[PDB]
Each structure stands twice: as C-alpha cells, then as structure tokens.
mmCIF file of N, CA and C and ligand atoms in Angstrom:
data_model
loop_
_atom_site.group_PDB
_atom_site.id
_atom_site.type_symbol
_atom_site.label_atom_id
_atom_site.label_comp_id
_atom_site.label_asym_id
_atom_site.label_seq_id
_atom_site.Cartn_x
_atom_site.Cartn_y
_atom_site.Cartn_z
ATOM 1 N N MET I 1 51.949 10.351 -35.699
ATOM 2 C CA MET I 1 52.944 11.465 -35.880
ATOM 3 C C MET I 1 53.663 11.383 -37.219
ATOM 4 N N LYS I 2 54.317 12.457 -37.633
ATOM 5 C CA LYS I 2 54.740 12.512 -39.003
ATOM 6 C C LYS I 2 56.231 12.306 -39.164
ATOM 7 N N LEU I 3 56.607 11.745 -40.311
ATOM 8 C CA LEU I 3 57.997 11.714 -40.744
ATOM 9 C C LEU I 3 58.116 12.554 -42.038
ATOM 10 N N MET I 4 58.868 13.644 -42.013
ATOM 11 C CA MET I 4 58.999 14.526 -43.148
ATOM 12 C C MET I 4 60.390 14.372 -43.712
ATOM 13 N N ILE I 5 60.489 13.906 -44.917
ATOM 14 C CA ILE I 5 61.760 13.652 -45.519
ATOM 15 C C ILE I 5 62.120 14.835 -46.447
ATOM 16 N N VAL I 6 63.026 15.689 -45.981
ATOM 17 C CA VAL I 6 63.345 16.992 -46.644
ATOM 18 C C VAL I 6 64.829 17.032 -47.097
ATOM 19 N N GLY I 7 65.148 17.817 -48.128
ATOM 20 C CA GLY I 7 66.457 17.821 -48.785
ATOM 21 C C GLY I 7 66.288 18.286 -50.213
ATOM 22 N N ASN I 8 67.347 18.756 -50.842
ATOM 23 C CA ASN I 8 67.217 19.232 -52.196
ATOM 24 C C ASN I 8 66.982 18.061 -53.150
ATOM 25 N N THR I 9 66.501 18.349 -54.321
ATOM 26 C CA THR I 9 66.311 17.325 -55.273
ATOM 27 C C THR I 9 67.614 16.627 -55.557
ATOM 28 N N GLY I 10 67.545 15.310 -55.670
ATOM 29 C CA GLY I 10 68.702 14.502 -55.976
ATOM 30 C C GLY I 10 69.451 13.908 -54.782
ATOM 31 N N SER I 11 69.037 14.259 -53.581
ATOM 32 C CA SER I 11 69.775 13.865 -52.397
ATOM 33 C C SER I 11 69.632 12.401 -51.949
ATOM 34 N N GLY I 12 68.574 11.710 -52.357
ATOM 35 C CA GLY I 12 68.408 10.315 -52.010
ATOM 36 C C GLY I 12 67.136 10.035 -51.264
ATOM 37 N N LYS I 13 66.272 11.018 -51.154
ATOM 38 C CA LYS I 13 65.153 10.916 -50.222
ATOM 39 C C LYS I 13 64.243 9.713 -50.480
ATOM 40 N N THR I 14 63.602 9.719 -51.636
ATOM 41 C CA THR I 14 62.793 8.630 -52.155
ATOM 42 C C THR I 14 63.497 7.276 -52.124
ATOM 43 N N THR I 15 64.754 7.144 -52.586
ATOM 44 C CA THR I 15 65.452 5.865 -52.443
ATOM 45 C C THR I 15 65.690 5.435 -50.970
ATOM 46 N N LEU I 16 66.062 6.370 -50.112
ATOM 47 C CA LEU I 16 66.166 6.054 -48.704
ATOM 48 C C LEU I 16 64.852 5.444 -48.230
ATOM 49 N N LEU I 17 63.716 6.055 -48.505
ATOM 50 C CA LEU I 17 62.500 5.672 -47.802
ATOM 51 C C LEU I 17 61.930 4.305 -48.145
ATOM 52 N N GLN I 18 64.150 2.062 -49.248
ATOM 53 C CA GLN I 18 64.924 1.098 -48.499
ATOM 54 C C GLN I 18 64.503 0.984 -47.031
ATOM 55 N N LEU I 19 64.145 2.098 -46.382
ATOM 56 C CA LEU I 19 63.736 2.069 -44.980
ATOM 57 C C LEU I 19 62.517 1.240 -44.678
ATOM 58 N N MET I 20 61.690 0.959 -45.658
ATOM 59 C CA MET I 20 60.426 0.295 -45.401
ATOM 60 C C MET I 20 60.496 -1.173 -45.719
ATOM 61 N N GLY I 21 54.889 16.022 -56.441
ATOM 62 C CA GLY I 21 56.060 16.508 -55.746
ATOM 63 C C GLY I 21 56.016 16.326 -54.241
ATOM 64 N N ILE I 22 54.945 15.746 -53.741
ATOM 65 C CA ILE I 22 54.925 15.351 -52.376
ATOM 66 C C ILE I 22 54.293 13.986 -52.376
ATOM 67 N N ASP I 23 54.885 13.055 -51.635
ATOM 68 C CA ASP I 23 54.436 11.669 -51.605
ATOM 69 C C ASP I 23 54.223 11.201 -50.168
ATOM 70 N N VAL I 24 52.957 11.070 -49.789
ATOM 71 C CA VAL I 24 52.567 10.769 -48.427
ATOM 72 C C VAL I 24 52.225 9.308 -48.355
ATOM 73 N N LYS I 25 53.004 8.565 -47.583
ATOM 74 C CA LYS I 25 52.815 7.129 -47.410
ATOM 75 C C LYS I 25 52.567 6.785 -45.915
ATOM 76 N N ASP I 26 52.110 5.549 -45.616
ATOM 77 C CA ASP I 26 51.967 4.995 -44.252
ATOM 78 C C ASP I 26 53.013 3.907 -44.045
ATOM 79 N N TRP I 27 53.825 4.047 -43.007
ATOM 80 C CA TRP I 27 54.917 3.107 -42.789
ATOM 81 C C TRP I 27 54.620 2.214 -41.593
ATOM 82 N N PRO I 28 54.194 0.980 -41.849
ATOM 83 C CA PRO I 28 54.026 0.020 -40.732
ATOM 84 C C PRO I 28 55.330 -0.542 -40.166
ATOM 85 N N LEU I 29 54.500 2.951 -33.123
ATOM 86 C CA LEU I 29 53.395 3.411 -33.943
ATOM 87 C C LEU I 29 53.732 3.114 -35.399
ATOM 88 N N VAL I 30 52.792 3.435 -36.291
ATOM 89 C CA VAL I 30 53.037 3.538 -37.745
ATOM 90 C C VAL I 30 53.126 5.015 -38.271
ATOM 91 N N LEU I 31 54.270 5.393 -38.856
ATOM 92 C CA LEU I 31 54.484 6.758 -39.308
ATOM 93 C C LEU I 31 53.712 7.014 -40.601
ATOM 94 N N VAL I 32 54.543 9.264 -43.395
ATOM 95 C CA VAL I 32 55.721 9.670 -44.201
ATOM 96 C C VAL I 32 55.438 10.676 -45.336
ATOM 97 N N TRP I 33 55.955 11.874 -45.190
ATOM 98 C CA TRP I 33 55.805 12.814 -46.272
ATOM 99 C C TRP I 33 57.151 12.979 -46.982
ATOM 100 N N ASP I 34 57.203 12.616 -48.250
ATOM 101 C CA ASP I 34 58.435 12.656 -48.950
ATOM 102 C C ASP I 34 58.273 13.766 -49.955
ATOM 103 N N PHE I 35 59.172 14.751 -49.814
ATOM 104 C CA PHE I 35 59.190 15.963 -50.592
ATOM 105 C C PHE I 35 60.286 15.853 -51.630
ATOM 106 N N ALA I 36 59.923 16.220 -52.839
ATOM 107 C CA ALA I 36 60.795 16.173 -53.928
ATOM 108 C C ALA I 36 61.945 17.144 -53.666
ATOM 109 N N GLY I 37 61.621 18.379 -53.261
ATOM 110 C CA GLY I 37 62.640 19.405 -52.980
ATOM 111 C C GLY I 37 62.130 20.634 -52.247
ATOM 112 N N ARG I 38 62.837 21.756 -52.428
ATOM 113 C CA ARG I 38 62.579 23.035 -51.752
ATOM 114 C C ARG I 38 61.220 23.627 -52.047
ATOM 115 N N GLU I 39 60.853 23.704 -53.322
ATOM 116 C CA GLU I 39 59.597 24.331 -53.720
ATOM 117 C C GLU I 39 58.401 23.651 -53.059
ATOM 118 N N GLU I 40 58.450 22.325 -52.986
ATOM 119 C CA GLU I 40 57.345 21.542 -52.488
ATOM 120 C C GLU I 40 57.164 21.656 -50.991
ATOM 121 N N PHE I 41 58.254 21.841 -50.251
ATOM 122 C CA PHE I 41 58.227 21.972 -48.795
ATOM 123 C C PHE I 41 57.725 23.390 -48.461
ATOM 124 N N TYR I 42 58.138 24.385 -49.245
ATOM 125 C CA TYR I 42 57.696 25.773 -49.049
ATOM 126 C C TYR I 42 56.179 25.839 -49.195
ATOM 127 N N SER I 43 55.649 25.138 -50.165
ATOM 128 C CA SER I 43 54.209 25.142 -50.436
ATOM 129 C C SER I 43 53.334 24.677 -49.310
ATOM 130 N N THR I 44 53.927 24.039 -48.306
ATOM 131 C CA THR I 44 53.123 23.472 -47.243
ATOM 132 C C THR I 44 53.417 24.211 -45.979
ATOM 133 N N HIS I 45 53.958 25.413 -46.050
ATOM 134 C CA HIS I 45 54.001 26.239 -44.855
ATOM 135 C C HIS I 45 52.543 26.309 -44.425
ATOM 136 N N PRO I 46 52.279 26.511 -43.114
ATOM 137 C CA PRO I 46 50.863 26.753 -42.711
ATOM 138 C C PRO I 46 50.263 27.965 -43.372
ATOM 139 N N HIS I 47 51.051 28.976 -43.682
ATOM 140 C CA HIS I 47 50.441 30.093 -44.357
ATOM 141 C C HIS I 47 49.753 29.638 -45.604
ATOM 142 N N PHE I 48 50.412 28.866 -46.463
ATOM 143 C CA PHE I 48 49.770 28.431 -47.693
ATOM 144 C C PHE I 48 48.635 27.418 -47.431
ATOM 145 N N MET I 49 48.805 26.438 -46.533
ATOM 146 C CA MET I 49 47.770 25.400 -46.281
ATOM 147 C C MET I 49 46.470 25.990 -45.830
ATOM 148 N N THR I 50 46.529 27.131 -45.139
ATOM 149 C CA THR I 50 45.338 27.825 -44.653
ATOM 150 C C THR I 50 44.888 28.978 -45.529
ATOM 151 N N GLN I 51 45.807 29.670 -46.178
ATOM 152 C CA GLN I 51 45.450 30.960 -46.752
ATOM 153 C C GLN I 51 45.486 31.008 -48.237
ATOM 154 N N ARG I 52 46.071 30.033 -48.869
ATOM 155 C CA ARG I 52 46.009 30.003 -50.307
ATOM 156 C C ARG I 52 45.331 28.728 -50.750
ATOM 157 N N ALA I 53 44.253 28.382 -50.031
ATOM 158 C CA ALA I 53 43.466 27.171 -50.306
ATOM 159 C C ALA I 53 42.098 27.502 -50.827
ATOM 160 N N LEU I 54 41.724 26.902 -51.952
ATOM 161 C CA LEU I 54 40.358 26.982 -52.429
ATOM 162 C C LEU I 54 39.699 25.627 -52.255
ATOM 163 N N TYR I 55 38.552 25.562 -51.596
ATOM 164 C CA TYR I 55 38.090 24.225 -51.169
ATOM 165 C C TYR I 55 36.928 23.774 -51.969
ATOM 166 N N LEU I 56 36.886 22.502 -52.370
ATOM 167 C CA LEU I 56 35.620 21.907 -52.849
ATOM 168 C C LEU I 56 35.089 21.093 -51.752
ATOM 169 N N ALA I 57 33.942 21.447 -51.212
ATOM 170 C CA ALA I 57 33.334 20.613 -50.169
ATOM 171 C C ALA I 57 32.371 19.650 -50.880
ATOM 172 N N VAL I 58 32.729 18.376 -51.000
ATOM 173 C CA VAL I 58 31.991 17.440 -51.914
ATOM 174 C C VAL I 58 31.126 16.505 -51.117
ATOM 175 N N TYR I 59 29.871 16.346 -51.462
ATOM 176 C CA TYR I 59 29.042 15.467 -50.673
ATOM 177 C C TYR I 59 28.222 14.559 -51.548
ATOM 178 N N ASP I 60 27.847 13.389 -51.039
ATOM 179 C CA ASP I 60 27.100 12.418 -51.833
ATOM 180 C C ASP I 60 25.595 12.600 -51.665
ATOM 181 N N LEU I 61 24.935 13.069 -52.721
ATOM 182 C CA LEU I 61 23.685 13.797 -52.574
ATOM 183 C C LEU I 61 22.542 12.798 -52.501
ATOM 184 N N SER I 62 22.887 11.520 -52.609
ATOM 185 C CA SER I 62 21.881 10.465 -52.655
ATOM 186 C C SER I 62 21.705 9.702 -51.334
ATOM 187 N N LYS I 63 22.556 10.007 -50.360
ATOM 188 C CA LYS I 63 22.329 9.583 -48.984
ATOM 189 C C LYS I 63 21.250 10.431 -48.315
ATOM 190 N N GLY I 64 21.086 11.659 -48.794
ATOM 191 C CA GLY I 64 20.065 12.586 -48.233
ATOM 192 C C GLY I 64 20.399 14.003 -47.704
ATOM 193 N N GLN I 65 19.663 14.410 -46.676
ATOM 194 C CA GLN I 65 19.849 15.721 -46.075
ATOM 195 C C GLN I 65 20.466 15.490 -44.704
ATOM 196 N N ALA I 66 21.262 14.461 -44.575
ATOM 197 C CA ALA I 66 22.036 14.329 -43.390
ATOM 198 C C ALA I 66 23.446 14.256 -43.817
ATOM 199 N N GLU I 67 23.658 14.252 -45.114
ATOM 200 C CA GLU I 67 24.991 14.423 -45.584
ATOM 201 C C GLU I 67 25.355 15.794 -46.079
ATOM 202 N N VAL I 68 24.354 16.655 -46.229
ATOM 203 C CA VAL I 68 24.568 18.097 -46.184
ATOM 204 C C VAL I 68 24.701 18.589 -44.746
ATOM 205 N N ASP I 69 24.501 17.684 -43.795
ATOM 206 C CA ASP I 69 24.552 18.035 -42.381
ATOM 207 C C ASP I 69 25.775 17.423 -41.705
ATOM 208 N N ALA I 70 26.242 16.300 -42.242
ATOM 209 C CA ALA I 70 27.566 15.785 -41.911
ATOM 210 C C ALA I 70 28.657 16.734 -42.394
ATOM 211 N N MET I 71 28.255 17.757 -43.142
ATOM 212 C CA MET I 71 29.205 18.619 -43.835
ATOM 213 C C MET I 71 29.441 19.940 -43.109
ATOM 214 N N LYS I 72 28.534 20.279 -42.199
ATOM 215 C CA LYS I 72 28.626 21.506 -41.467
ATOM 216 C C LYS I 72 29.868 21.600 -40.629
ATOM 217 N N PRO I 73 30.242 20.526 -39.970
ATOM 218 C CA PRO I 73 31.517 20.425 -39.264
ATOM 219 C C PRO I 73 32.737 20.602 -40.155
ATOM 220 N N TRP I 74 32.703 20.121 -41.412
ATOM 221 C CA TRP I 74 33.755 20.410 -42.396
ATOM 222 C C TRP I 74 33.850 21.856 -42.708
ATOM 223 N N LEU I 75 32.672 22.457 -42.886
ATOM 224 C CA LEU I 75 32.633 23.862 -43.187
ATOM 225 C C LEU I 75 33.092 24.696 -42.008
ATOM 226 N N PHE I 76 32.784 24.256 -40.777
ATOM 227 C CA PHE I 76 33.294 24.884 -39.539
ATOM 228 C C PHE I 76 34.834 24.740 -39.278
ATOM 229 N N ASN I 77 35.392 23.600 -39.601
ATOM 230 C CA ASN I 77 36.831 23.455 -39.553
ATOM 231 C C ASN I 77 37.580 24.237 -40.629
ATOM 232 N N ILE I 78 37.132 24.117 -41.886
ATOM 233 C CA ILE I 78 37.518 25.043 -42.983
ATOM 234 C C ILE I 78 37.503 26.541 -42.577
ATOM 235 N N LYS I 79 36.633 26.914 -41.660
ATOM 236 C CA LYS I 79 36.528 28.265 -41.235
ATOM 237 C C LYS I 79 37.487 28.485 -40.108
ATOM 238 N N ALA I 80 37.681 27.499 -39.265
ATOM 239 C CA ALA I 80 38.619 27.683 -38.203
ATOM 240 C C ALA I 80 39.968 27.986 -38.808
ATOM 241 N N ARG I 81 40.435 27.130 -39.712
ATOM 242 C CA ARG I 81 41.743 27.326 -40.379
ATOM 243 C C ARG I 81 41.954 28.728 -40.940
ATOM 244 N N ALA I 82 40.973 29.268 -41.660
ATOM 245 C CA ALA I 82 41.029 30.649 -42.167
ATOM 246 C C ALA I 82 39.628 31.039 -42.508
ATOM 247 N N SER I 83 39.162 32.182 -42.015
ATOM 248 C CA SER I 83 37.698 32.441 -42.078
ATOM 249 C C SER I 83 37.213 33.095 -43.395
ATOM 250 N N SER I 84 38.179 33.614 -44.167
ATOM 251 C CA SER I 84 37.932 34.238 -45.479
ATOM 252 C C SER I 84 37.872 33.267 -46.672
ATOM 253 N N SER I 85 38.053 31.966 -46.410
ATOM 254 C CA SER I 85 38.452 30.985 -47.443
ATOM 255 C C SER I 85 37.320 30.458 -48.250
ATOM 256 N N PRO I 86 37.510 30.430 -49.566
ATOM 257 C CA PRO I 86 36.369 30.239 -50.424
ATOM 258 C C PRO I 86 36.018 28.779 -50.450
ATOM 259 N N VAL I 87 34.732 28.480 -50.566
ATOM 260 C CA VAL I 87 34.276 27.110 -50.564
ATOM 261 C C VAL I 87 33.289 26.951 -51.691
ATOM 262 N N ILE I 88 33.373 25.848 -52.424
ATOM 263 C CA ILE I 88 32.450 25.528 -53.494
ATOM 264 C C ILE I 88 31.784 24.214 -53.150
ATOM 265 N N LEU I 89 30.508 24.227 -52.815
ATOM 266 C CA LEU I 89 29.816 22.996 -52.421
ATOM 267 C C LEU I 89 29.473 22.213 -53.643
ATOM 268 N N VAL I 90 29.866 20.943 -53.694
ATOM 269 C CA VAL I 90 29.411 20.036 -54.797
ATOM 270 C C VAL I 90 28.827 18.705 -54.318
ATOM 271 N N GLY I 91 27.548 18.521 -54.623
ATOM 272 C CA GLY I 91 26.867 17.257 -54.374
ATOM 273 C C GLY I 91 27.009 16.332 -55.581
ATOM 274 N N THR I 92 27.460 15.108 -55.358
ATOM 275 C CA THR I 92 27.636 14.196 -56.445
ATOM 276 C C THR I 92 26.533 13.122 -56.409
ATOM 277 N N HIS I 93 26.605 12.137 -57.309
ATOM 278 C CA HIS I 93 25.610 11.085 -57.378
ATOM 279 C C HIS I 93 24.247 11.695 -57.683
ATOM 280 N N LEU I 94 24.168 12.638 -58.657
ATOM 281 C CA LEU I 94 22.874 13.214 -59.193
ATOM 282 C C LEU I 94 22.125 12.089 -59.812
ATOM 283 N N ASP I 95 22.732 11.381 -60.761
ATOM 284 C CA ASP I 95 22.121 10.211 -61.407
ATOM 285 C C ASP I 95 21.358 9.239 -60.446
ATOM 286 N N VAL I 96 21.797 9.087 -59.197
ATOM 287 C CA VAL I 96 21.202 8.089 -58.298
ATOM 288 C C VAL I 96 20.333 8.609 -57.103
ATOM 289 N N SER I 97 19.708 9.783 -57.217
ATOM 290 C CA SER I 97 18.955 10.412 -56.068
ATOM 291 C C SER I 97 17.557 11.006 -56.369
ATOM 292 N N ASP I 98 16.616 10.913 -55.428
ATOM 293 C CA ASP I 98 15.195 11.295 -55.674
ATOM 294 C C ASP I 98 15.096 12.603 -56.409
ATOM 295 N N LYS I 99 19.143 22.335 -45.351
ATOM 296 C CA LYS I 99 19.940 22.284 -46.549
ATOM 297 C C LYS I 99 20.628 23.660 -46.818
ATOM 298 N N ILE I 100 21.238 23.780 -48.013
ATOM 299 C CA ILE I 100 22.041 24.916 -48.438
ATOM 300 C C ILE I 100 21.146 26.115 -48.625
ATOM 301 N N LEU I 101 22.438 26.850 -44.941
ATOM 302 C CA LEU I 101 23.700 27.542 -44.653
ATOM 303 C C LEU I 101 24.028 28.712 -45.633
ATOM 304 N N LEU I 102 23.381 29.843 -45.361
ATOM 305 C CA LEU I 102 23.478 31.085 -46.108
ATOM 306 C C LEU I 102 24.852 31.756 -45.978
ATOM 307 N N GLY I 103 29.439 31.836 -39.292
ATOM 308 C CA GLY I 103 30.021 30.610 -38.744
ATOM 309 C C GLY I 103 30.642 29.811 -39.855
ATOM 310 N N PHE I 104 30.113 30.044 -41.062
ATOM 311 C CA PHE I 104 30.440 29.306 -42.288
ATOM 312 C C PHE I 104 31.346 30.120 -43.178
ATOM 313 N N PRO I 105 32.183 29.469 -44.009
ATOM 314 C CA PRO I 105 33.137 30.253 -44.832
ATOM 315 C C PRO I 105 32.468 30.960 -46.037
ATOM 316 N N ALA I 106 33.191 31.714 -46.867
ATOM 317 C CA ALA I 106 32.545 32.412 -47.998
ATOM 318 C C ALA I 106 32.247 31.370 -49.023
ATOM 319 N N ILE I 107 31.015 30.877 -49.027
ATOM 320 C CA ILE I 107 30.577 29.833 -49.959
ATOM 321 C C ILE I 107 30.345 30.478 -51.309
ATOM 322 N N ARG I 108 31.290 30.243 -52.203
ATOM 323 C CA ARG I 108 31.405 30.834 -53.539
ATOM 324 C C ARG I 108 30.211 30.476 -54.497
ATOM 325 N N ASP I 109 29.874 29.186 -54.608
ATOM 326 C CA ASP I 109 28.732 28.707 -55.416
ATOM 327 C C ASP I 109 28.305 27.333 -54.978
ATOM 328 N N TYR I 110 27.483 26.653 -55.736
ATOM 329 C CA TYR I 110 27.147 25.297 -55.333
ATOM 330 C C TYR I 110 26.560 24.552 -56.540
ATOM 331 N N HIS I 111 27.067 23.360 -56.791
ATOM 332 C CA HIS I 111 26.755 22.632 -58.004
ATOM 333 C C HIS I 111 26.109 21.286 -57.663
ATOM 334 N N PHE I 112 25.451 20.679 -58.655
ATOM 335 C CA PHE I 112 24.938 19.307 -58.569
ATOM 336 C C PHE I 112 25.472 18.454 -59.718
ATOM 337 N N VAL I 113 26.475 17.608 -59.464
ATOM 338 C CA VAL I 113 27.100 16.858 -60.564
ATOM 339 C C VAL I 113 26.756 15.356 -60.596
ATOM 340 N N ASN I 114 27.110 14.736 -61.702
ATOM 341 C CA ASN I 114 27.195 13.302 -61.834
ATOM 342 C C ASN I 114 28.664 13.179 -62.147
ATOM 343 N N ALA I 115 29.434 12.748 -61.142
ATOM 344 C CA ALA I 115 30.888 12.978 -61.100
ATOM 345 C C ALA I 115 31.646 12.048 -62.012
ATOM 346 N N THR I 116 30.877 11.240 -62.729
ATOM 347 C CA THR I 116 31.284 10.059 -63.495
ATOM 348 C C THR I 116 31.413 10.230 -65.058
ATOM 349 N N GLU I 117 30.785 11.248 -65.654
ATOM 350 C CA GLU I 117 30.884 11.528 -67.112
ATOM 351 C C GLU I 117 31.012 13.042 -67.349
ATOM 352 N N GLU I 118 31.585 13.486 -68.473
ATOM 353 C CA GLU I 118 31.641 14.943 -68.808
ATOM 354 C C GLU I 118 30.191 15.505 -68.918
ATOM 355 N N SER I 119 29.999 16.803 -68.653
ATOM 356 C CA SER I 119 28.681 17.480 -68.864
ATOM 357 C C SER I 119 28.889 18.896 -69.397
ATOM 358 N N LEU I 120 30.864 23.004 -63.326
ATOM 359 C CA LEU I 120 31.776 23.228 -62.226
ATOM 360 C C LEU I 120 33.164 23.624 -62.666
ATOM 361 N N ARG I 121 33.675 22.933 -63.678
ATOM 362 C CA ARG I 121 35.096 23.046 -64.063
ATOM 363 C C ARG I 121 35.555 24.483 -64.364
ATOM 364 N N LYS I 122 34.639 25.352 -64.757
ATOM 365 C CA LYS I 122 35.050 26.713 -64.943
ATOM 366 C C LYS I 122 34.852 27.505 -63.642
ATOM 367 N N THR I 123 33.813 27.172 -62.848
ATOM 368 C CA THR I 123 33.551 27.899 -61.579
ATOM 369 C C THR I 123 34.777 27.803 -60.692
ATOM 370 N N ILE I 124 35.632 26.804 -60.924
ATOM 371 C CA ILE I 124 36.821 26.654 -60.106
ATOM 372 C C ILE I 124 37.779 27.816 -60.448
ATOM 373 N N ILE I 125 37.489 28.989 -59.865
ATOM 374 C CA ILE I 125 38.402 30.173 -59.834
ATOM 375 C C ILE I 125 38.329 30.898 -58.513
HETATM 376 N N1 GDP E 1 26.665 7.019 -60.176
HETATM 377 C C1 GDP E 1 27.636 7.779 -59.634
HETATM 378 N N2 GDP E 1 28.682 7.216 -59.010
HETATM 379 C C2 GDP E 1 29.659 7.975 -58.434
HETATM 380 C C3 GDP E 1 29.650 9.432 -58.488
HETATM 381 N N3 GDP E 1 30.732 9.882 -57.828
HETATM 382 C C4 GDP E 1 31.389 8.812 -57.384
HETATM 383 N N4 GDP E 1 30.735 7.695 -57.737
HETATM 384 C C5 GDP E 1 31.071 6.318 -57.479
HETATM 385 O O1 GDP E 1 31.012 6.275 -56.060
HETATM 386 C C6 GDP E 1 32.240 5.765 -55.542
HETATM 387 C C7 GDP E 1 32.839 6.967 -54.772
HETATM 388 O O2 GDP E 1 34.213 6.835 -54.804
HETATM 389 P P1 GDP E 1 35.344 7.907 -54.814
HETATM 390 O O3 GDP E 1 35.348 8.633 -56.125
HETATM 391 O O4 GDP E 1 36.568 7.100 -54.651
HETATM 392 O O5 GDP E 1 35.064 8.633 -53.446
HETATM 393 P P2 GDP E 1 36.031 9.382 -52.399
HETATM 394 O O6 GDP E 1 36.329 8.575 -51.190
HETATM 395 O O7 GDP E 1 35.352 10.603 -51.892
HETATM 396 O O8 GDP E 1 37.408 9.630 -52.999
HETATM 397 C C8 GDP E 1 33.030 5.279 -56.761
HETATM 398 O O9 GDP E 1 32.823 3.893 -57.074
HETATM 399 C C9 GDP E 1 32.471 5.999 -57.965
HETATM 400 O O10 GDP E 1 32.476 5.185 -59.173
HETATM 401 C C10 GDP E 1 28.502 9.996 -59.201
HETATM 402 O O11 GDP E 1 28.387 11.253 -59.298
HETATM 403 N N5 GDP E 1 27.590 9.120 -59.722
#
C-alpha cells in the first residue's frame, strides 16, 4: 500500500521522510511517493496516468519470439487503462540477436534498436 507525502513546496516533506518532482521510495508491511508540490500531484490524477500517456513498449529482441509474446499482456493492460492510447513497440539488443499483432492499443510504429549507442527519438510524438 502507498504512502503519499503531499503539501506545497517548502513544507518539509522530503526532510520529514527522518522517518526512515516525484520521488518514489520503498520504506522497510513495507510502504512512499514524495511529491515536490501541487503541480506534481495534479499530474498523477488518474485522468493523466491513463489518458495523457504515450507508451514505449520495450522488449529484448534476443530472447526470441516469446518475448514479443510476454508483451501481449502489457499491450492488453495498456488497453484496459485507456483504449485509444498510443504505443510504440521497441525491440532492443539488435547487436546480440540472430510476431508484430496488427484487443490491442493504437500501435503507432515499431523500431529495432541497439539501445547502447547513438544511431526512434523523433518518432516519439
Ligand atoms: N548489447 C546491448 N545491451 C543492452 C541493450 N539494451 C540494454 N542492454 C544491456 O542490457 C541490460 C538491460 O538493462 P536495463 O537498461 O537496466 O534494463 P531495464 O530493466 O529494462 O531497465 C544492461 O546491462 C544494458 O547494458 C542493447 O540494445 N544492446
């Protein structure tokens, strides 16, 4: 369960959390979301978490075609949250390797990267 530490900027939130723009920690049940202020707490209304989200669904492409299949449930939950929500599939680990669901969200594009060096970055719109 969650502990949400809310208050205007400057109130003591971060210093209080002595107890042990958004800072999510685990406090050893074991609980902590620490919000800098008003703007940051507003941003996490469920409306925004579901409806103003652009998703990168990232998978490791060198395990095979069961990790494009471990991903279908992600794509199904992404759809449960909001069914119009854009998704960009990215398989990583191109450098190390020898399928793409036409129920699923609006899959915007799909890339094959080596996530480790410069060569997607513009498709992110
Ligand atoms: N060769 C190669 N290694 C990668 C690539 N992407 C991630 N890695 C490595 O694989 C591991 C994956 O870790 P990480 O980036 O933390 O994965 P995360 O759990 O999804 O956040 C790291 O050691 C990376 O150095 C890639 O595209 N190519």
